[PDB]
Design a binder for these strands. Structure first.
Ligand SMILES: Cn1c2ccccc2c2c1cc(C#N)c(=O)n2-c1ccc([N+](=O)[O-])cc1
Ligand SMILES: OC[C@H]1O[C@@](CO)(O[C@H]2O[C@H](CO)[C@@H](O)[C@H](O)[C@H]2O)[C@@H](O)[C@@H]1O
Ligand SMILES: [N+]
Lengths: 553, 415
DNA sequence: TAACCCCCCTTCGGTGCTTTGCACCGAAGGGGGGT
């Protein structure tokens, strides 16, 4: 005698009616095997037959279980999903083995036929109607409606998942000494009890589920490590990911690299040093998934270095709340950053990488701050606290940055680790004009129609230059003018401009840019010894600003 | 046995659907304990995923407070909730509160937990408590009473509030009392010792209703000591070309605020093409212009005043060395107030804590002066602010904000 | 020939000020993973 699960009220979107889509042409191979399952569900109580008074319908079909002789049945409720009320998902994230505390006894079991053990809403079962062709639609055919949560309905995951929590709620309160990680129907159970009391605790829970109609088939009951859980392998003192499949195909399409880079990201959670910059660079462009891509020299070298990391097996450890969390970051170049999170040296809880390039112009300090932020949020999710950081940047470098930057920025408690390449600021702008340094009044202009322009400067010593430019913009000529002044000045120079655009970029001390021109300006700034940038308003009759504006306009 | 005040949303607007953000261990444990006690006491009830609404929740510790407090980010719900001024449940603002020598802020939100809430509106107060490492899916709740931090709670409770304060107000006719969100502002011109005494009077006066996070805390303000930060022009005896260029640029920016400012005679000093460090003396015409511009910066702007129907906007600039400037306005370049903060908590070590402090200081001043909280333009990168601001938040309300990046070309608000 | 969830890389269009160019950023759509 099972206990009935209270149904969850489900509605359609206001002013909308059930789905009426009828059926797609079905091959006889599928039409046959389906009718066998229809009767099985009717006998088992999963489905009801009566549907002549039901004007709604949703297509049905089936395909093969992954590399199995069995046919998998699924309903395309995409039309009903549009008409179904919106749900708030209670699944907020994916649990991670690096967050598991070591438990003396562990068990992993699943619920048999989860969706089909949860009663659908009494009033809503009518909208799940579906029709199967008897024999190629020769005869009307058998119609059915779901009495339980069907696969493919946007509300099934949230409803089952929440029902699972109410069922587990009493057991956990009456057994606080146990830890249960519930992910859908997959359950992780661990305790420091003796294996005997553990199997007793397991059977108390295993019966607690059957009372509410939830079976626990021994086909999915794991009692001996390594436990297969969430795509990992759980050993008593270590964990690792289930083996990864690296495509070795010698002819790479667009979709080949997408699948390739995808698996490398998944591997980067424990395999240190994974890089996907050059491989993903091949993917940039609105090219179809079928186009074959020749691997560049760097993209081929990056893939080789990844094989060197993945050829060797790596393991992760478990979390110890008594010890502090340590996060260490290393610079990999080209805006790539890798990190490791650990509590004791060389026994990593997990690893990761940050390679996001945000903004056309940036520097290593900004990217390091962003890597720290990603790690921080990731750590609060898995462990609920912020780790201590070991960063390849000197305290002096960071202080100079955050104290001078006009935007508020901060890094949590951290210490410097001398692990080249170090992060540094490649140049620093003066705060006051340099005495005895030539003053370049720069300016630029571009004809909006012809796209032609000029860039140049005039100096206090009578030095002048004007340069013609083709296929340019006002903004580009303003940067070009500054570049000219840096090229044509000594190691110390004062530069006066009215380009708010140019000053905003340069004052942020970028060390890398998507703009060829900005990178050339950076190259000049790194060579200088003193550079004072000053802004003045345009068209106000100021100094050489009015003079150079004439030359270039 | 108390009937519930019906509340609707603004027509044509759905409910709040804001995802819960990750919480630290200490914040989740404090929430579980708090929500456990609130469920026992009937103030909240668990719900399922059939409720499509959600509002972020987290916890704070107020200034010099060691116990956790629960805070719900009802910003999305407050914007979607019907304005109670149109329902005529709006609370007027006393222009004399900012004039009192001392103002104490009392957390009275705890009293909201006694009034029931409109049943049809309870589904909009849904929130989700997360778990570390996603061990358990989200645990969802909803409110059965007036929730703290909701803009309708002080409006619905206003009728009960005026009753409880009637004895205190009529025995002390000079003390001003203003209610905003879960806080009560009580200002007086009395002596500090007598002010704190009359505050304790109102505390036990509040017990005489609660007898028929907690009430005990109180923070003292002094709005009569609040000053403004005016635009200042340096005074030099000798000026370099760079000095006059900076001056001309600053005055050109300032002319958008003060229309009477002129820079013609000062620009002529920059006619040639000179080295930035060259000292050049002022012409007789330029000396009058500089002095005249300072006068114009001494007087207030013409036709700038507070419009109750317009929203308040606050801009903040990081000036370095723990200095932070801000301006409050409703129309661009028509500033209602300009100010500067310095030596706040976190100065010289933590930019986010200083900015969080500045946001709270400025909001408090806007509530006292206009009874409105401003929408903030924050000088910070979105991800940086979102990663840290809850670690330093110490108020029971949360203002609206957006993220700006304005490089300082001219030092306008701070020399 | 699909349901929900987390992540990364790319493109792209919407937004605003650096203006009718250029940059910031969130939504998708690709991929990886989980049930
Ligand atoms: C590829 N795949 C899967 C792959 C592995 C496991 C489940 C699914 C799956 C799917 C796909 C769907 C769909 N639609 C689906 O509903 N499920 C599913 C998930 C959980 C349960 N249950 O807990 O009972 C039922 C169906
Ligand atoms: O609201 C969405 C999302 O944006 C953030 C970013 O800081 O800011 C908003 O937060 C409020 C909801 O909590 C919005 O109502 C408000 O308009 C805005 O400040 C986050 O706070 C929020 O998660
Ligand atoms: N110009």
């Amino acid at each position: 005698p099972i206990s009935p699960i209270e149904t969850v009220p489900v509605k359609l979107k206001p002013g909308m009616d059930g789905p009426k889509v009828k059926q797609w042409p079905l091959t006889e191979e599928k039409i046959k095997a389906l009718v066998e399952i229809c009767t099985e569900m009717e006998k088992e109580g999963k489905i009801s037959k009566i549907g002549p008074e039901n004007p709604y319908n949703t297509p049905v079909f089936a395909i093969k279980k992954k590399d199995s002789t069995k046919w998998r049945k699924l309903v395309d409720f995409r039309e009903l999903n549009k008409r179904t009320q919106d749900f708030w998902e209670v699944q907020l994230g994916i649990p991670h083995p690096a967050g598991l505390k070591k438990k003396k006894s562990v068990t992993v079991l699943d619920v048999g036929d989860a969706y089909f053990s949860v009663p659908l809403d009494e009033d809503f079962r009518k909208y799940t109607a579906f029709t199967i062709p008897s024999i190629n639609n020769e005869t009307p055919g058998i119609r059915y409606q779901y009495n339980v949560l069907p696969q493919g309905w946007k509300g099934s995951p949230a409803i089952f998942q929440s029902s699972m929590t109410k069922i587990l709620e009493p057991f956990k309160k009456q057994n606080p000494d146990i830890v249960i990680y519930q992910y859908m129907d997959d359950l992780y159970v661990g305790s420091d009890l003796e294996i005997g009391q553990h199997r007793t605790k397991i059977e108390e829970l295993r019966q607690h589920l059957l009372r509410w109609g939830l079976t626990t088939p021994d086909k999915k009951h794991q009692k001996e490590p390594p436990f297969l859980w969430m795509g990992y392998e759980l050993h008593p003192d270590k964990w690792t990911v289930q083996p990864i499949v690296l495509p070795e195909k010698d002819s790479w399409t667009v979709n080949d690299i997408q699948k390739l880079v995808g698996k490398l990201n998944w591997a980067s959670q424990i395999y240190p040093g994974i890089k996907v910059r050059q491989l993903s660079k091949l993917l940039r462009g609105t090219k179809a998934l079928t186009e074959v891509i020749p691997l560049t020299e760097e993209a081929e070298l990056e893939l080789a270095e990844n094989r060197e990391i993945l050829k060797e097996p790596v393991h992760g450890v478990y979390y110890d709340p008594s010890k502090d969390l340590i996060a260490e970051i290393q610079k990999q170049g080209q805006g790539q950053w890798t990190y490791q999170i650990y509590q004791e040296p060389f026994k990593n809880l997990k690893t990761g990488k940050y390679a996001r390039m945000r903004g056309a112009h940036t520097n290593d300090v900004k990217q390091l701050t962003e890597a720290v932020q990603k790690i921080t949020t990731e750590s609060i999710v898995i462990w609920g606290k912020t780790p201590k950081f070991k960063l390849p940047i000197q305290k002096e470098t960071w202080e100079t940055w955050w104290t001078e930057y006009w935007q508020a920025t901060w890094i949590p408690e951290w210490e410097f680790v001398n692990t080249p390449p170090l992060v540094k600021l490649w140049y620093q702008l003066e705060k006051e004009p340099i005495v005895g340094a030539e003053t370049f009044y720069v300016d630029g202009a571009a004809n909006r129609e012809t796209k032609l322009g000029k860039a140049g400067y005039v100096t206090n010593k009578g030095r002048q230059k004007v340069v013609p430019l083709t296929n340019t913009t006002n903004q580009k000529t303003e940067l070009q003018a500054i570049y000219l002044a840096l090229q044509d000045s000594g190691l110390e120079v004062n530069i006066v401009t009215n380009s708010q655009y140019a000053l905003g970029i340069i004052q942020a001390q970028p060390d890398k840019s998507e703009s060829e021109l900005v990178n050339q300006i950076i190259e000049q700034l790194i060579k200088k010894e003193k550079v004072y940038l000053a802004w003045v308003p345009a068209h106000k009759g100021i100094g050489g600003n009015e003079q150079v504006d004439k030359l270039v306009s | 046995p108390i009937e519930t005040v019906p509340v609707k949303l603004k027509p044509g607007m759905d409910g709040p659907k804001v995802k819960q953000w990750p919480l630290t261990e200490e914040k989740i444990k404090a929430l579980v304990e708090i929500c456990t006690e609130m469920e026992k006491e009937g103030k909240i009830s668990k719900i399922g995923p059939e409720n499509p609404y959600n509002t972020p929740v987290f916890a704070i510790k107020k200034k010099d407070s060691t116990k956790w407090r629960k805070l719900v980010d009802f910003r999305e719900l407050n914007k979607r909730t019907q304005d109670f001024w149109e329902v005529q449940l709006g609370i007027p603002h006393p222009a004399g509160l900012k004039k009192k020598k001392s103002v104490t802020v009392l957390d009275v939100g705890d009293a909201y937990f006694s009034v029931p809430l409109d049943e049809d509106f309870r589904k909009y107060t849904a929130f989700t408590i997360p778990s570390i490492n996603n061990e358990t899916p989200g645990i969802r709740y909803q409110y059965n009473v007036l929730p703290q931090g909701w803009k309708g709670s002080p409006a619905i409770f206003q009728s009960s509030m005026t009753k409880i304060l009637e004895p205190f107000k009529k025995q002390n006719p000079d003390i001003v009392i203003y209610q905003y969100m879960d806080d009560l502002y009580v200002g007086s011109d009395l002596e500090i010792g007598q002010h704190r005494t009359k505050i304790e009077e109102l505390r036990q006066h509040l017990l005489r209703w609660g007898l028929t996070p907690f009430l005990w805390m109180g923070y003292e303000l002094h709005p009569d000591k609040w000053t403004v930060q005016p635009i200042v022009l340096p005074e030099k005896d000798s000026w370099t070309v760079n000095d006059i260029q900076k001056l001309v640029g600053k005055l050109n920016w300032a002319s958008q605020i003060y229309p009477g400012i002129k820079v013609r005679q000062l620009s002529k000093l920059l006619r040639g093409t000179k080295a930035l460090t060259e000292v050049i003396p002022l012409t007789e015409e330029a000396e009058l212009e500089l002095a005249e511009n300072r006068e114009i910066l001494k007087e207030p702007v013409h036709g700038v005043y507070y419009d109750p129907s317009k929203d308040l906007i606050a801009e903040i600039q990081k000036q370095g060395q723990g200095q932070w400037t801000y301006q409050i306005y409703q129309e661009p370049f028509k500033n209602l107030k300009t100010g500067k903060y310095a030596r706040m908590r976190g100065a010289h070590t933590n930019d986010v804590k200083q900015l969080t402090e500045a946001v709270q200081k400025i909001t408090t001043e806007s509530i006292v002066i206009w009874g409105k909280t401003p929408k903030f333009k924050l000088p910070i990168q979105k991800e940086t602010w979102e990663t840290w601001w809850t670690e330093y938040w110490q108020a029971t309300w949360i203002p609206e904000w957006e993220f700006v990046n304005t490089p300082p070309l001219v030092k306008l608000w701070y020399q």
